From a paper:
The secretins are a large and diverse family of integral outer membrane (OM) proteins which comprise key components of the type II and type III secretion systems, as well as the biogenesis systems for type IV pili and filamentous bacteriophage. Our previous work on [name] from [name] showed a dodecameric structure, with a chamber sealed at both ends. Other proteins seem to play a more direct structural role: PilP is a lipoprotein which binds to [name] and is essential for type IV pilus (TFP) formation.
In order to generate a structure which would allow docking of the domain structures presented above, we determined a 3D reconstruction of the complete [name] dodecamer by cryoelectron microscopy. The chamber is sealed at both ends, and a cut-away view shows evidence for distinct and separate structures within the density map (marked on the right hand side of Figure 6A). Structures of the B2 domain (B2PilQ224–329) and N0/N1 double domain (N0N1PilQ343–545) were docked into the cryoelectron density map using MULTIFIT, a program which has been shown to work well for structures with multiple components, even with low resolution maps. We therefore propose that the first β-domain adopts a partially folded structure in the [name] oligomer, sufficient to contribute some density to the map, but have omitted it from our model as it remains poorly defined at present. PilP projects outward from the assembled [name] complex, in an orientation which is different from the T2SS GspD-GspC complex: in that case, GspC was placed closer towards the interior of the secretin chamber. It is also readily apparent that the PilP C-terminal domain lies close to the B2 domain, essentially sandwiched as a ‘wedge’ between the N0 and B2 domains. One obvious function of PilP, therefore, is to stabilize the [name] oligomer during secretion, preventing disassociation and consequent disruption of the channel.
Numbering used by the authors:
A (entry chain D), C (entry chain C), D (entry chain B), E (entry chain A), F (entry chain L): 226 to 325, 343 to 516
B (entry chain N): 84 to 165
């Protein structure tokens, strides 16, 4: 005896089970939570009750789980949302289970669409002119109702999406985001500790000197990439923002933020000696 | 032709390279004797003639008696043997 | 019973399985994730369920895994991307599985090409005149769309590629990179701790003296190789860069950086006594 | 049953396997990674699945590995680069496997040649007049393309080779190298800790006195060997170099460096009392 | 079954193996690394697979190693350099294996010769007049090519040989060496810690008094043996050397060095009170 | 079965082996290192493979070692230097193995002779008039060539022999030696720690008072035995020596040295108050 999983048709979760020594048919119990399959006189060994790991397979089947019963063989096929069960017997012994910040109010329903497209759609909605960087993120799914596009935008940003900066006529949205850049970086890092790390945001007060004066230097260090002149910069999502009350906010990796802070404070100190 | 006419082909193999800019040439050696070859050169025991070179391999074409019992060309690429 | 793996044809992942004591044919289940092969009355011992380690073999087969079933022999052949399964029976017992900073917008698609070539291609694109050092790195694969070459370049650099410095007409790109040089060095080091180490970048403030004055000395120490006069230098990717606001940025191994810092600070101090 | 390894012909890796109780022939599976040999009804005991240690034997066979199968005997013969497999049956039972700083641009291809020769070749190339010490190192293999000889030289030095000093017309290259001298010394040392040790380089600042004045004394201590007058000196690769900005750089073993530092600082201090 | 080793002829490594219960002949596999001998139906017990310890026996056989095979008896006879294998059967059961500072440039090839002779040979070479002490060391083997005798001499010294002092016309070379004297002493010491110890060299600065004045006292303490007047002295290789810049260098055992330092510093201090 | 050792003839090492249940004769393998004796069908128990401890027995046999073989009985009789093996069979079962400071240059060859005699011989050699104390040591064996008697004397002293003091015409040599007196004392001491202890030598500086003035007192304390007037004294090898630069050197047991130091310093202090 043994269990197996596979996808077919259109996002369908098939569960091919191997029944050696069976004649009739088991008891199929389609539940709202999982599935149940008992096989009288089919007691399988604990060395064959292995479970599946089909997680995030984009299927109605959460995960297959095999468990040996007293004298029979019980099967647990966790599912999700609305679905339908379909048993198929290609032969006497082989069993299968086909598991198949102020704007107009809008309802935002985007199913598995690129954020970039959602960005465009909103703009088309007469919601500003939004222009992203190039490779901001990926695709996301949100469904909202009765929400102004501006509000939905903020909610959208939080989901996994980007942060927004507005030039005024045109708005640039960038991947300057805590979670994605670092999350991926964490996985990339071999060390477990590295798995814990963070891009963080910090506010730098500038007492002595004007914030704008810093811009030239900050832009330069920020560009740890080639770029003649970019306010937004590479180094994988580091950003410096200038608030009105002459403070600088930096969002990025800790290393990059550290560098920026050192320079800012450093310049500020000589301004300080008055 | 050249001294190489005193060495066989079994002893002739890829021992090194030699380029300049982007011409990329192949350096072969026979029984110790070192002799390079580039696009359109001479090699092998009988009448060897290289046509092109490549990374970790060279495309040549010699001339040895066979298939009749008389000298006859024969192309063939070698894989850098390091 | 036993399992085996081998490559043939054109980047194909073949899985030769040894079936001793079998007559008919097993149940081949081609899934979108992995493969399944059950052999009734072919229960193999746990001492033969060894798995393969064909990782990074440039094949559609991620890795072969053998597992003993209750009374049969289940096989798990993890795969990736689109592929096709092909079973071959050369005899009654032997089974096989053939698994077969401002520029014009451009889309950069480079499949397994040398960075150097990508460098040239961009230049040909009228994107500056880019000249690398000699042995900067290796080959890389990126695919981008709707991105200016300058932006793509930065992204390219981050992937594994180099950093860029521009003379103005011509740009020199060098392997001055944290990851490659050190990563390889880590592997080289026998000690596990050594596996953790780093080339790092640091910014040196120069209060008292002009940055350029340092250049002669820094160039000299940097050349721990023969070189009459090179701004970029050997010692495997150490670099000194001079920012406009008279600060020096050094990127390299910690040891080399330490040396450079000591000298810079040392010269600065006597300048300091005014 | 048992496995064996031996070299013959011309750098060929032969794997003589002892098959006692076999009639037909096993299944030879030549893979791009390793080899596979199954022997039905030849199940060997775990007390005979010993592996080989033919590492750095200058052969296509990385290392032989024997493993007992369920009912057969699987063999794993790791290989490298392009090779060919050849089975030979000298008798019904005995199996065998014959596994068979500015210069002109140059491409440097040296296959297993003495560094000294490479040194000469470069000089012949009109690249300076390079003269090594006598016993600088050994032989090395590098293959480069499109690199100026001066650059290649630096790369060559790093590989395992020496450092270079130039008189001006003639250049002397010496084994003053961190890795070789110490690496060998480490192996020499019985103590494990000793295995970790280092020749290091340090820069000595000379504030008070001129660097050249030190030369006489430093040369003397450096010569812990007989030598009437040598700038380079024995004591297995200790060297003192004088930079223009009156600093001394010493490269050598820690003990020797310590001695040199003590003297330099010592002389400097009395100069210091002004 | 059992294994044995013995030397005969002219530096030959014989391996007498006891085969009780054998008729035909085993499989002799002469490899470039070691030897292989399989005996079908001769499976020996693990209580007879003892190995040999013929290390430094001046033979082609590194060391004999016996290992019990599945059903046979495998033998591993590690070897070195070029050699030849010769099997001999004195009877049906008994197996045997007969394993059979500026000078002219010179090439120094000395095979197993006394250092003293090498010393003389060099002198004969018109390389100074070198006179050793009496019992400096022993014999050593070096082979060099294209090296000036003066350089080779330094290399020779390092190998295990002595250090040299030159009177000017005649040179005296003495066993004043870190390794030999102490190494032997270490072995002599019963305590394991003692095995770690050292003769070391240290430099004593003499600020206040002239170095020569010390000579009388230092010579006296150094002679912890009878000696009317010797610059070099007993106490098993203790030496005091006077550098030009009035510093004393002492090379010897730590105890002796400590004594010398105490006296030197002691005399220096009263000179110090000016 | 069992092994035995005994001496006979003239310094011969006999190895009487008990072979119960043997008919023919074993395989005698005379090696340059040890001996080998195999007895087919004579497998002895591990409870009879006891080894011998005939160390320092003044015989060619280093030590006998018995080891049980697979089915036979192997014997290991370590030897040294040139020797000859002789087997004797007094009966069918009993086996036996009869293992049978400026002077003229001189070569000193003394084989197992009293140091005292060597002392006399040297004197006879016109090497001073050497008179020892009475019970200086024992006998020693040295063989030197091409060494002046004065030098050989120093070497002789170091071997185990005494230190020398010269009156001028006549020289007195005494057992004032670190190793012998203490070594024996160590063995004498029951405590293991006591096994580690030492007679040591120390130098006492005498700033304030003349060294000779101390002599009376030092002689007295030194004589912890009856002695009207002796510069050398009892208390088992304690000695005080007066160097020219008014320092005292004392060689002896730590306890005695401590006493002497206390007195010397004590007298010096009152001299000190000037």
């Amino acid at each position: 005896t043994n269990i197996d999983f596979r996808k077919d048709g259109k996002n369908a979760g098939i569960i091919e089970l191997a029944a050696l020594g069976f004649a009739g048919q088991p008891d199929i119990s389609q539940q709202h939570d999982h599935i149940i399959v008992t096989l009288k006189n089919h007691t399988l060994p604990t060395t064959l009750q292995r479970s599946l790991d089909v997680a995030d397979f984009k299927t109605p089947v959460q995960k297959v789980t095999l468990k040996r019963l007293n004298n029979d063989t019980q099967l647990i096929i966790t599912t999700a949302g609305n679905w339908e069960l379909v048993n198929k017997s290609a032969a006497p012994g082989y069993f299968t289970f086909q598991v198949l910040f102020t704007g107009r109010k809008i309802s935002l329903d985007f199913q598995d669409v690129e954020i970039r497209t959602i960005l465009q759609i909103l703009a088309k909605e007469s919601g500003m002119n939004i222009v992203a960087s190039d490779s901001v993120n990926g695709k996301m799914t949100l469904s909202l109702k009765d929400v102004p596009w501006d509000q939905a935008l903020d909610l959208v940003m939080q989901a996994r999406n980007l942060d927004m900066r507005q030039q005024g006529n045109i708005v640039n949205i960038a991947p300057r985001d805590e979670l994605l850049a670092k999350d991926k970086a964490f996985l990339q890092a071999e060390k477990d500790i590295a798995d814990l790390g963070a891009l963080y945001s910090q506010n730098f007060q500038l007492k002595y000197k004007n914030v704008e004066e810093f811009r030239s230097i900050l832009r330069l260090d920020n560009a740890d990439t080639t770029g003649n002149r970019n306010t937004l910069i590479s180094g994988r999502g580091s950003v410096l923002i200038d608030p009105a009350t002459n403070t600088l906010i930096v969002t990025d990796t800790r290393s990059v933020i550290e560098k920026f802070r050192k320079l800012i404070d450093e310049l500020d100190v000589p301004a300080q000696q008055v | 032709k050249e001294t190489l006419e005193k060495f066989s082909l079994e002893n002739m193999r890829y021992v090194g390279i030699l380029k300049s800019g982007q011409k990329v040439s192949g350096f072969i050696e026979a029984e110790g004797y070192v002799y390079t070859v580039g696009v359109g050169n001479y090699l092998g025991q009988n009448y060897g003639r290289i046509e092109s070179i490549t990374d970790d391999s060279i495309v040549l074409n010699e001339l040895i008696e066979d298939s009749t019992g008389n000298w006859v060309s024969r192309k063939a690429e070698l894989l850098l043997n390091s």
